[PDB]
Every structure is written in structure tokens, then in C-alpha cells.
Amino acid sequence: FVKVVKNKAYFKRFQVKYRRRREGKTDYHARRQMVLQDKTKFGSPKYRLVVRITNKDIIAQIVQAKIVGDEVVMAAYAHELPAFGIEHGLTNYAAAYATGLLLARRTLAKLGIADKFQGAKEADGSYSAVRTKKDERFPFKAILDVGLARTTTGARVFGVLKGAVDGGMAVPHRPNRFPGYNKEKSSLDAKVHRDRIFGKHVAEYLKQVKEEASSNPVQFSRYMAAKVLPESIEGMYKKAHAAIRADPSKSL
């Protein structure tokens, strides 16, 4: 017939991978280099900005690697943004920026380093050029760990990036993968990036859904079921950043 590949000899000599490699959760080739620090820094704390965006949630958490298992310092989620005035988005780019702000406000108040290192109380799209020791008092430094997400110029793991940066945390980055960045012109556009900080790109497409589904007779069903309107999407976030930045420890 056909030769069986999976002989008993196949099973006897099979070397299984790591558990979170079989499960498809960890890139250990990047895990190793993110955790790697100088040996002359004799076990100094090094923090990762672990952002993980699921189908219905944004998970942003500050994590220190240990030999016994990684030690989460103050996680922050997107499903607890309804405690702040955002009932609707929760997986868009405008809730990436809110979860990153709400992470960098809960983290500095955890340290006591808030009311210093606050930064960009009203947001722009413009690049900041983060001050770190590789480059007075230094801000709290964590590096951004996308895990396995494809870092494209406009992605939502980079909205948590400017959430954390404009929340007072010091993450090293260049603006090459912000949404309002042009590859061949090599110049940032702060108009286009600020618009999806405050969810304007939802509002020109929530408008088309309420305008091309009222002339013609499932997209944005729970928003059309709600009384929510365009022109009330953009100011909904600006007011919701006040609810985050003034009191971030609130939740559901």
C-alpha cells in the first residue's frame, strides 16, 4: 500500500517543541531578544509592553520577565473602558489609544510617578522622540512587544503605542508604522493619525451605514440599535480621555 510516515520510530525520536510554540502563542526567537539585557546590568528590571488584540478585546499589560514566570505589573483591558464613557468601540484604533492611555496612567500611579510625566493632555498625531537613557528625571521605560501580530503601518498595536507614549510612559519607537505616515515621502501626517485617535474614520463609515441602509430598504447593528450618532463619536473620546487621565483606577 502506502508507507506510513508515523512509524513507531517516528514517535520514538520525535522532539516536541515548546508548549507555547505548539499552541501558537510565543515567538521564542523574539522572546529571547526582548528579554535579553546586558550582563553588566546585573538583573535590572526590564519591562515589556505586551499588547495582545483579540476579536473582542485589547489587552495591554506591563510585564517583567522572571525565571519562575513573567510578573505582570498592572494590566489594562478594553472591556473596562465602558467605566469611562466608551460603550461602543472596544476593538478599534480609537480604543487602542484609550487602553494605552489607561495603561500608562495606572502604571505611573502604581509607581507614584504621576503628576510628573503626564504628557500630551490633548492629543496630536505628531511624533514625540521619546527620551530614554540610551539617548533631568527619565520617564518609565518599557518596550513594546507585539508578539505575533504583523506590524503594518496603521495597525492597532501601534495605537496602544501612542496611548502609552502620550500617557507618560517612555516606549522607544520611530513613527514609521503610525497610520498617518507615508513610506515614499518619509514624512508623518499628524492630521490622518489624530483622526483615528478620536475615531473619525468610524464616523465616515457609520455615516455610510446609516445612509446606505435607509435608502436601499448587520454592520454597526448595536450602534444603530443605540441612539449614537456621527459627530458624537469624536467628542465621545475627548471627554473619555478626561475620565481616564484624571482617575484611571476605575473599572466595572
Partner 1 sequence: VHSYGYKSGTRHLFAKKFRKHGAPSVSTILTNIKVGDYVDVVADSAVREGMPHKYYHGRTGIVWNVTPRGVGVIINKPVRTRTLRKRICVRFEHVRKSRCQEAFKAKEHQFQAYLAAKKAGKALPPLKKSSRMGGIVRPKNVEVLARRVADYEA
Partner 2 sequence: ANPMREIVVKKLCINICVGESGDRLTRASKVLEQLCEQTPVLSRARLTVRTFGIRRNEKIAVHCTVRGKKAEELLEKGLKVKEFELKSYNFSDTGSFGFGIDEHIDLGIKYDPSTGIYGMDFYVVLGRRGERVAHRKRKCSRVGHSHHVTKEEAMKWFEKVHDGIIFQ
Partner RNA sequence: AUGAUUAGAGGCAUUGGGACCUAUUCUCAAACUUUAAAUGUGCAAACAAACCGGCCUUAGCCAAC
Partner RNA sequence: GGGCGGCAUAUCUGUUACACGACAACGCAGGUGUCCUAAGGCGAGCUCAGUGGGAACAGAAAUCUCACGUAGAACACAAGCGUAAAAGCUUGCUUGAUUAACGAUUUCCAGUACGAAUCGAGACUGCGAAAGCAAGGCCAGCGAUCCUUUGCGAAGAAUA
Partner RNA sequence: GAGUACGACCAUACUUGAGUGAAAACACCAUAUCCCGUCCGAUUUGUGAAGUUAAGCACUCACAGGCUCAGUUAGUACUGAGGUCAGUGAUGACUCGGGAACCCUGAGUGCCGUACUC
Interface with partner 1 by CB under 8 A: which residues? 13-15, 28-29, 31-32, 35-36, 38-40, 42-43, 65-67
Q: What residues form DSSP beta bridges with 63? A: 48, 72
For residue 77, the tally of other CB atoms under 10 A from its CB is 17
Which of 9, 17, 23, 121 lies at the binding interface for partner 2 (CB under 8 A)?
23
Instruction: Report, in Å, the least distance between residue 100 CB and RNA.
Output: 13
Site for RNA in 142-201 (CB under 7 A): 143-157, 172-174, 176-177, 179, 182-183, 192, 196, 199, 201
Residue 212 binding target from RNA, partner 1, partner 2, none, CB below 5 to 8 Å by type: none
Angle between the 234-245 and 93-111 helix axes, to the nearest 10 degrees?
A: 10
Q: Supply the angle between the helices 190-197 and 200-211 in degrees, to the nearest 10.
A: 70
Binding mask 57-96 for RNA (x = CB under 7 A): x-x-x-x-xxxxxxxx-xx-x-x--------xx-xxxx--
> Strands 47-53 and 142-145, how do they pair?
parallel
Point out residues after which the chain has a gap (C–N over 2.5 Å): 135, 217
Q: Least Å distance between CB 6 and partner 1?
A: 17
Question: If binding is defined by CB under 7 A, does position 227 make contact with RNA?
Answer: no
Q: Is residue 112 packed enough to be buried (19+ CB in 10 Å), middle (13-18) or exposed (0-12)? A: exposed
Residue 94's binding partner out of partner 2, RNA, partner 1, none, with CB under 5 to 8 Å set by partner kind: RNA
Nearest approach, Cβ of residue 206 and partner 2 (Å): 25
* Cβ 222 vs Cβ 89: under 8 Å: no
The alpha carbon of residue 103 and the mean position of all alpha carbons in its chain are separated, in whole angstroms, by 9
**What residues between 94 and 153 interact with partner 2 by CB under 8 A?**
147-150
What residues line the site for partner 2 (CB under 8 A)? 23-25, 147-150
